[PDB]
């Protein structure tokens, strides 16, 4: 304070070799000005003293384009590691002084610091920050909450809404929901304007939306049954991938001009979607974009039948059957839209991708140890039945060992010749290894994952009917007739009568008088 | 036994007879090749054949047959040892882990249930 | 220390900050720089690793006897420094191993098996 | 401690003149003679919130130059 009564600047910009990146160097990155850190070092009297200075500018952007509420946000990284200082610290220069220019203020690449809550991830902060309860009415008009009207214990709560949903461009739930590289999406997505919004969306439209793609593909899904399977067969070597009949009752024409446009319309969907993120190859490939991934091999494995006719290769048929064994195994994506099924289908999910590449990695490796050794001693100038003919090679003993997994017939402890006692000293060691050791290890392996993950797994679900429900909206270009909100509901400003709002109940809790109200307190709107 | 049949197995074979008709017709396609089932005539050869084929999987079925059957058996095979990969070491042993969890929480109020 | 395996007094002597100036020079923690909440934080490294003989780290890694071996390596001198070896060379070293084994592995495969 | 294990045996089987140095080396101690010692530099976080008494350089993030 002495050197502010001599007279120090208060509005300096620490530019640097720090705001580094790879936070094991220095990149301590606060907003380079004597404000920012002063917050930031949790030293609220002098924060206050700051705020003495008249000369003291706080619009001003330093270095990314950020002012104070900027790297604010960006130091909010645990409830542990914390003591949730800057919650009340963001709190008091609000309240200190705010305007909503200094709020509505991007930055160099242009982005809303409501907008960092969701791209940093700081939870607990944008945990406050929706509610944003304002109690002085001076100054109440800068709320995210409005008591519209209370009437003691059940009250009529009331979310901001302004810049939440895809109304306009990049709104908070776009970030959010098509975020990588954050493992706290799910846990996010709690909160009430983004919990139960999904829920008010999906009631009107997007139930009904996702069951009419779920039929045209399960009945996609038939008509390519039938056409591949009752009469491909007439004899002769014609290729004929569709089949047509240009005769009578044309249900056979019905069958090709369908299918050809499904795929190449299910083609160009997911086209789009495949240009659009960009993965690190293994975290979002191989839980979101997998069974996008998995459509846009579907499709051109469908097309490619009707290329098979145009020099009449090999594999017109041999083709014709991967697109079908696929097709129906997709329709396990589209199982989602009901309550407990949906909880499987991570439980489907993970366990391919944590517990079984672990195992085949490991069984495929005694698979050739004991596969190679066994056809060693299979050869033995007496393979099976007078090897003169017959076969008694390589794959032979894979299989007579592959069978062993399951019923095989038999086992042969025959004449495989010159000590067999090793032979079958090998094969019961893969008993011991591979039937009672190395088989039920993945068994109590799958017991310890599944317990893990389900207590969060209902919120992965939860992510990914809000990964679809977007989509549909984005492949609704209409006027948007689906009114999923109260609109235009005006606020306490006297001129702002604006921003649409929303409706919520709360219970038995704080029990108080109630200063701050909207209305004469009817639960309806009058009328 | 009354609450495992209601929360578990329909989850089980709603899934576990989808995949049952999706390899069930798949490997009812090369099933047929003009070679079915044994100098294919008068034999059977056609849709419920490789259905209990693949049905038989689950359990002791005898022997596997990597014969004739004709265009691509590595294709043909290929797709037999998926059903394997899936149905005999991934979605069965996936109940089995699922059955534990709910047992436990179950049974420290299931007495009541019962009074 | 190590040998007893006593590891709280271990986590203990490593640290050994010094507040006082006059007698500061015999710790094993000295703050480089500080700067608040994000330091740079410093171990002494004397008679850490083998560039001397029968170094701390060479009796934890080599000692039997014990059971709480596993739990003491999570010190910050013994933890972040085999993550530092294994980085600029080890990992590279294990692989060179890894492949002369598993083609070596291979060469026994085909001559006693194709001809 | 099994890559631990296997670690150290990699360099006990490296008799060379120790190419990879792993480490700060020789960094100066605050005793006015004893400038050896070979250092380390690590990172810490967020508590114990206070004015810091000792330190050994005017703060850069790496060596100076």
């Not at 009415?137 to 003691?152: I, Q, V």
């Not at 008010?200 to 045209?216: P, R």
């Not at 893990?452 to 209902?458: A, D, I, T």
Request: glycine share 4%; charged share 20%.
């Amino acid at each position: 304070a002495v050197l502010i009564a001599a007279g120090a600047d208060v509005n300096a910009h620490a530019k640097g070799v720090f705001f580094n990146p790879k936070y094991q160097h220095e990149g301590f990155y606060f907003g380079e000005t004597p404000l920012a850190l002063a917050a930031c070092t949790n030293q609220p009297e002098i924060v206050q003293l700051l705020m003495e200075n008249e000369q003291t500018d706080i619009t001003s952007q330093d270095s990314r384009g950020n002012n104070i509420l900027h790297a604010l946000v960006t130091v909010a990284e645990d409830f542990k590691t914390q003591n949730d200082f800057v919650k009340r610290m963001y709190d008091m220069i609000l309240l200190r002084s705010g305007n909503w220019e200094l709020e509505t203020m991007r930055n160099n690449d242009g982005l809303t610091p409501l907008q960092l809550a969701a791209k940093m991830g700081k939870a607990e902060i944008l945990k406050y920050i929706l509610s944003r309860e304002i109690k002085e009415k001076p100054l109440r008009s800068l709320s995210r909450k409005f008591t519209d009207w209370a009437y003691g214990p059940v009250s009529s709560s009331l979310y901001d809404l302004t810049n939440v949903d895809t109304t306009t461009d990049n709104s908070v739930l776009e970030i959010i929901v098509y975020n990588t590289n954050i493992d706290n999406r799910h846990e996010m997505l709690t909160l009430e304007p983004l919990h139960t919004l999904l829920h008010t969306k999906w009631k009107k439209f997007a139930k009904y939306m996702f069951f009419l793609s779920f039929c045209f593909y399960f009945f996609y899904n038939i008509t390519l049954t039938l056409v591949s399977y009752y009469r491909p067969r007439e004899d002769e070597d014609l290729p004929h991938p569709l089949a047509l009949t240009h005769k009578m009752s044309w249900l056979q024409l019905l069958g090709r001009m369908f299918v050809l446009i499904w795929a190449t319309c299910i083609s160009v969907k997911e086209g789009i979607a495949i240009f659009l993120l960009r993965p690190s190859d293994l975290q979002s490939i191989l839980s979101d974009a997998w069974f996008h991934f998995v459509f846009f091999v579907q499709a051109v494995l469908v097309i490619l039948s009707v290329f098979l006719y145009l020099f009449a290769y090999k594999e017109y048929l041999a083709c014709l059957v991967l697109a079908m064994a696929l097709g129906w195994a997709n329709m396990l994506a589209y199982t989602r839209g009901f309550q407990s099924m949906g909880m499987y289908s991570v439980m489907i999910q993970k366990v391919i991708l944590h517990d079984v590449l672990k195992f085949l990695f490991v069984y495929i490796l005694f698979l050739l140890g004991f596969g190679v050794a066994l056809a060693s001693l299979i050869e033995k100038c007496s393979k099976d039945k007078k090897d003169c003919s017959s076969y008694g090679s390589f794959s032979d003993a894979v299989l007579e060992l592959f069978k062993l997994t399951i019923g095989l017939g038999d086992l042969n402890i025959q004449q495989n010749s010159t000590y067999p006692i090793l032979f079958l000293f090998l094969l019961i060691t893969y008993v011991i290894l591979t039937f009672v050791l190395l088989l039920n290890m993945l068994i109590a392996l799958m017991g310890e994952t599944v317990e893990n993950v389900s207590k969060e797994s209902e919120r992965i679900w939860r992510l990914q009917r809000a990964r679809t429900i977007l989509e549909f909206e984005k492949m609704l270009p209409e006027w948007l007739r689906s009114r999923f909100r109260m609109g235009e509901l005006c606020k306490v400003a006297d001129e702002d009568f604006r921003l649409c709002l929303r409706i919520n109940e709360v219970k038995w809790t704080e029990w108080k008088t109630h200063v701050s109200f909207l209305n004469e307190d009817p639960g309806p709107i009058r009328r």
